[PDB]
Design goal:
It is a single chain. The protein is α+β, with helices and mostly antiparallel strands. It folds into 2 domains: 82 residues, Phosphorylase Kinase, domain 1; 211 residues, Transferase(Phosphotransferase) domain 1 (Transferase(Phosphotransferase), domain 1), CATH 1.10.510. 33% of the residues lie in helices and 14% in strands. The chain is built from 9 helices and 12 strands. The strands form 4 sheets. It has a 5-stranded antiparallel β-sheet with strand order 3-4-6-8-7, with helices on one face. A 3-stranded antiparallel β-sheet has the order 1-2-5, with no helix packed on it. Bound molecules: 3-[(2,4,6-trimethoxy-phenyl)-methylene]-indolin-2-one. It is classed as transferase.
């Protein structure tokens, strides 16, 4: 039908670790939006709490604008800017893997996004390539990479005092295997380091086309997070980053080694990719592999 008083829904463009997303269209300007629906029940990670996060990060580079949030019957709606394909499809579309260049350039923006968030006293806690999108196909941001879905973001520090909160090693465990940090796997709580670490498992996913721990038999589901973690653990960073820019190794080695409160030297990490682009004689122009088709 039509919700958000002046936003009409279109087709389904996918779902996210939370709940379906349809691509609407504001009925008062003709601009294509993103509409997220969510039922009102046991769940309450409410687009609201996500809305509030889309609010906070609002104004920080590569963060989608928020446009609405209400209560339409059995649901909760959150209106958001439309955006291009996810880095995950792109990968698939670009031929199961990207090229050092493309990676290096993505890493920067990505890594930039995971910082902004951290500077808002929030761990992102759900780092996967499926969460990074590019501006709409033919616009002024097509060559930009955004972050989406903050359904798992948490406060790792009082946004005010910036005083870091606790450090357990005993709660739940309900994320996305393939890229989480080893800490995460071990039960440890997640700090800004866990975000940077999984980001590198993701950069190596791009380069390698896969990680060494994907696919694991003998288990089920609440156990797979084990076999995967183990392999991750029994997989040396040399072997993993083997045959790829040293910076990448340098990156992973850094991340996989920070303390639970360690404030990442974001500039150091950003510099590593800039060099990677310096060796290639290229520049941070957006010749991603995905603008040729
Ligand atoms: C992982 O689940 C999610 C992944 C998302 O983008 C890839 C989004 C946000 C999206 C968004 O803001 N625009 C889109 C256009 C197509 C598909 C998803 C989006 C989302 O809603 C917040 C949940």
């Amino acid at each position: 039908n039509v919700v958000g008083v002046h936003y009409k829904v279109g087709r389904r463009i996918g779902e996210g670790s939370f709940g379906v997303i349809f691509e609407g269209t504001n009925l008062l300007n003709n601009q294509q939006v993103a509409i997220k629906f969510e039922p009102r029940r046991s769940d309450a990670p409410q687009l609201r709490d996500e809305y509030r996060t889309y609010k906070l990060l609002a104004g920080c580079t590569g963060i989608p604008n928020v446009y609405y949030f209400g209560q339409e019957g059995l649901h909760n709606v959150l209106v958001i800017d439309l955006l291009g394909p996810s880095l995950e499809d792109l990968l698939d579309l670009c031929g199961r893997k990207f090229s050092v260049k493309t990676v290096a350039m993505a890493a920067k923006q990505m890594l930039a996004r995971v910082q902004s968030i951290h500077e808002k006293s929030l761990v992102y806690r759900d780092i996967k390539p499926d969460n990074f999108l590019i501006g709409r196909p033919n616009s002024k941001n097509a060559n930009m990479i955004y972050v989406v879905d903050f359904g798992m973001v948490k406060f790792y520090r009082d946004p005010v005092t910036k005083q870091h909160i606790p450090y357990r090693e005993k709660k739940n465990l309900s994320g996305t295997a393939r890229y989480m940090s080893i800490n995460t796997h071990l039960g440890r709580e997640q700090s800004r380091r866990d975000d940077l670490e999984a980001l590198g498992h993701v950069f190596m996913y791009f380069l390698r086309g896969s990680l060494p721990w994907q696919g694991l038999k003998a288990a089920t589901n609440k156990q797979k997070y084990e076999r995967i973690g183990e392999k991750k653990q029994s997989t040396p960073l040399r072997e993993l980053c083997a045959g790829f820019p040293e910076e990448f190794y340098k990156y992973m080695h850094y991340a996989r080694n920070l303390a639970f409160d360690a404030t990442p030297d974001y500039d150091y990490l950003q510099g590593l990719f800039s060099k990677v682009l310096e060796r290639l004689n290229t520049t941070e122009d957006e010749n991603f592999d995905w603008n040729l088709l």
